[PDB]
Amino acid sequence: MPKHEFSVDMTCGGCAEAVSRVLNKLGGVKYDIDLPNKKVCIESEHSMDTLLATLKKTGATVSYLGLE
């Protein structure tokens, strides 16, 4: 159960948040959305593929800090 952390600046709070929902399809794994921290921590069996697609979906900036 590896964890992947991605840095994304919420621009479409309203839409960017809804965009995260689509991640379940790409990832379908456990994910957490913390606006107050502006950070998203998701654990996937693939990692480095589900986050980028979802994060960039709303055209929000995406930066990979690294994964286990």
Curated annotation (Swiss-Prot):
Start and end residues of each HMA domain? 1-63
Give the recorded effect for residue 21 to E: Has no overall effect on Cu(+)-bridged heterodimer formation with ATP7A
The entry lists its GO molecular-function terms as: ATPase binding; copper chaperone activity; copper ion binding; copper-dependent protein binding; cuprous ion binding; metallochaperone activity
Q: Which GO terms describe its cellular component?
A: cytosol
- The entry marks the following residues as binding Cu cation, namely 12, 15
Tissue localization of expression is: Ubiquitous.
Q: Which GO terms describe its biological process?
A: copper ion export; copper ion transport; intracellular copper ion homeostasis; negative regulation of apoptotic process; response to oxidative stress
Write down the InterPro entries for this protein, in alphabetical order: Copper_transport_ATOX1-like (IPR051881), Heavy-metal-associated_CS (IPR017969), HMA_dom (IPR006121), HMA_dom_sf (IPR036163)
Subunit composition and interactions? Homodimer. Interacts with ATP7B. Interacts with ATP7A. Interacts (via dimer form) with SLC31A1 (via C-terminal domain); this interaction improves ATOX1 stability and controls intracellular Cu(I) levels.
| Domain remarks | The heavy-metal-associated domain (HMA) coordinates a Cu(+) ion via the cysteine residues within the CXXC motif. The transfer of Cu(+) ion from ATOX1 to ATP7A involves the formation of a three-coordinate Cu(+)-bridged heterodimer where the metal is shared between the two metal binding sites of ATOX1 and ATP7A. The Cu(+) ion appears to switch between two coordination modes, forming two links with one protein and one with the other. Cisplatin, a chemotherapeutic drug, can bind the CXXC motif and hinder the release of Cu(+) ion.
Task of the protein: Binds and deliver cytosolic copper to the copper ATPase proteins. May be important in cellular antioxidant defense.
Q: Which family does it belong to?
A: Belongs to the ATX1 family.
Q: What is this protein called?
A: Copper transport protein ATOX1
Where is the organism placed in the taxonomic lineage, from the top? Eukaryota, Metazoa, Chordata, Craniata, Vertebrata
